[PDB]
Amino acid sequence: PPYTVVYFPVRGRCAALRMLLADQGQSWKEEVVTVETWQEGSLKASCLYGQLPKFQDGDLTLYQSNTILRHLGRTLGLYGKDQQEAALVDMVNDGVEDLRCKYISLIYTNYEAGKDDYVKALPGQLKPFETLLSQNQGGKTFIVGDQISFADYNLLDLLLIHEVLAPGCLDAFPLLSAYVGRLSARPKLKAFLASPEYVNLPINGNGKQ
Amino acid sequence: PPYTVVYFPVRGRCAALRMLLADQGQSWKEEVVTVETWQEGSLKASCLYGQLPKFQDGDLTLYQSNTILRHLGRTLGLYGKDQQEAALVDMVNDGVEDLRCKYISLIYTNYEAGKDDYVKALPGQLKPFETLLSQNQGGKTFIVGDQISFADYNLLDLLLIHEVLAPGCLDAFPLLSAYVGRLSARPKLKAFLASPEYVNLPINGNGKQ
Numbered sequence A, B: 001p002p003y004t005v006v007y008f009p010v011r012g013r014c015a016a017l018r019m020l021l022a023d024q025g026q027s028w029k030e031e032v033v034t035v036e037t038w039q040e041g042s043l044k045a046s047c048l049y050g051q052l053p054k055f056q057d058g059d060l061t062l063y064q065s066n067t068i069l070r071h072l073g074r075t076l077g078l079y080g081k082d083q084q085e086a087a088l089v090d091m092v093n094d095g096v097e098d099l100r101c102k103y104i105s106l107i108y109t110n111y112e113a114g115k116d117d118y119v120k121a122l123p124g125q126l127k128p129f130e131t132l133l134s135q136n137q138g139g140k141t142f143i144v145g146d147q148i149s150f151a152d153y154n155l156l157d158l159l160l161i162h163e164v165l166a167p168g169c170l171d172a173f174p175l176l177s178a179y180v181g182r183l184s185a186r187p188k189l190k191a192f193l194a195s196p197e198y199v200n201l202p203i204n205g206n207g208k209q
């Protein structure tokens, strides 16, 4: 610490890391980037890959949402109990990232024409996570092992936004549904999810969800 | 160990991990999956995300190319010297993955109509990697710190395939150009890159590059 997340006024790719920070009782500052600032050019030019989120942890500056998640993951002990679990955590996170990319593509480039097909394909895309849970001794705790990892926050967010996109999409997935309820009930997380800081923000930049 | 990589007969998303294994003096077995076998559907259905590569390390089975890279990276000591460097390694790898996704999209979904635009946009996409090199000991060593990381192998592959797609793309990037040759000259890697095992394989699976 200290922590500062620089991002647009959207939950988007910062939702998961914010939930992680909140649930872990961490304090951070939010720097909201306006269209004027982004269009001005200097901020974007200073970003490694010309994109947000940008994250600051003391004198350390990071870019890439998954890099931020993994960083918080290793420094806060949310990256498995050993090397094997760490690998499983990565496998889950990469899976989440893949689906998040498809979701982002839908929302920003083909919402009207592609939504129906996407929803029809959704069950096939969610099944792997239901499987991950069932393989983890019944899926009664977390996605990997018996301790929370950065992958849980990323998956949780993925599931939450998909329930908004397709209400009831988790009905055919008992474990994932209960998993959502369980994690969302964690005291600190529950408080954050209900805070104006979270509720006020649109899931995506164009208001589509 | 022992290691087994299950994949289609192409370089694709296994090129980087293979270079890593070879350069680190590791032995592994290759399980080739033909197009016909893949189309039969059974292996596909058993894969967590319905995709290859599939990797075996003893009793452990991992999917997702970056999970395999990170696994090899942490178990073989190719993941930075400390937590901060590990974060920088991730930042580089995520950047590589992002461009690899755009490359894959071009190759498989819009090669004929999209190549020219992609090549025009290439310099802007490669610049971030040249800059990282310049900030790390004048770009005279590795992408992060002074020891090789899994990110180096992934970036190296990304650069190699781009020189095939757009010959001369690295001329305007001195550090990246010298970097590719330096890593390619490493004895074990050099031997692997010249082996029939690598040479006889097409870069992609649709005959485009």
Ligand SMILES: N[C@@H](CCC(=O)N[C@@H](CS)C(=O)NCC(=O)O)C(=O)O
Pocket: A008, A012, A013, A044, A050, A051, A052, A053, A063, A064, A065, A066, B094, B098
């Ligand atoms: N791989 C990056 C992707 C971030 C991203 O797509 N950022 C976009 C959407 S918020 C952005 O900054 N767009 C502004 C621009 O590219 O000019 C991550 O995971 O953080």
Ligand SMILES: N[C@@H](CCC(=O)N[C@@H](CS)C(=O)NCC(=O)O)C(=O)O
Pocket: A094, A098, B008, B012, B013, B044, B050, B051, B052, B053, B063, B064, B065, B066
């Ligand atoms: N995110 C995965 C992507 C792997 C991937 O896209 N595999 C494709 C291309 S080789 C595949 O298995 N395609 C066959 C199919 O989807 O049916 C990774 O990083 O390993």
